[PDB]
Amino acid sequence: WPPRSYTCSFCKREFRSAQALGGHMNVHRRDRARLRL
Ligand SMILES: [Zn+2]
To answer: If you write DSSP's letter for every residue of 1-37 in order, what string do you get?
Structure first.
């Protein structure tokens, strides 16, 4: 993802903070799982 806040490419959530971002992906965890990197 690009800098200047982060957005989830699944539910379109907003979070500049990595604390919210990292945890937010955990609540998804559906299919793909890294895919390649
Ligand atoms: Zn994400």
So the answer is: --SSSEE-TTT--EESSHHHHHHHHHHH--S-TTTT-
Residue 23: alpha-carbon gap to chain centroid: 8
Per domain, the residue ranges of the chain are 1-37
Residue 37 vs residues 14, 32, 33, 34: alpha-carbon distances, Å: 22, 10, 9, 5
Q: How was this structure determined?
A: NMR
Ligand 1: distance of its center to the CA of 35 in Å?
A: 14
Q: 33 alpha carbon to ligand 1 midpoint, in Å?
A: 12
